[PDB]
Structure 1
Amino acid sequence: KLALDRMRLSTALKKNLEKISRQSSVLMDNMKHLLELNKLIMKSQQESWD
């Protein structure tokens, strides 16, 4: 069930890529926040490894 739902979401999101780039959304702010958080998370993970 999860795989089917993920594939459906993936194709439905790929079909409308340019609309989420021209006038996209506050989703762009959400994406930039996620992009800012992921790098710090990975750096902390590497430090913990060492």
Structure 2
Amino acid sequence: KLALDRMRLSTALKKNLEKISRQSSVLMDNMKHLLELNKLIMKSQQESWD
């Protein structure tokens, strides 16, 4: 069930990708914040490894 749902979301998201980079939406903002987080988390993970 989960795999089917993810595939559906991926294809629908692909079909409307051009509309997304027009942006000027709350969802576009959320994506910019998400990029900032992931980077910090991965750096902290590497330091913990060492």
TM range (shorter): over 0.9
Q: What residue ranges of structure 1 are gaps of 5+ in the alignment?
A: none
Q: Secondary structure at the match of 2:21?
A: helix
Counterpart Cα distance in 1 of 2:23 and 2:39: 26
Q: Identify the structure with bigger relative contact order (alpha carbons < 8 Å, sequence gap 6+).
A: 2
Q: How many residues align?
A: 50
2:23 aligned with 1:23:
yes
Worse overlay, 20-29 or 8-17: 20-29
Q: What residue ranges of structure 2 are gaps of 5+ in the alignment?
A: none
Worse overlay, 21-30 or 1-10: 21-30
Q: How much has 1:23 moved relative to structure 2? A: 3.4
Q: How much has 1:46 moved relative to structure 2? A: 0.2
Counterpart Cα distance in 2 of 1:24 and 1:7: 27
TM-score (normalizing by structure 2) = 0.93
Counterpart Cα distance in 2 of 1:34 and 1:23: 16
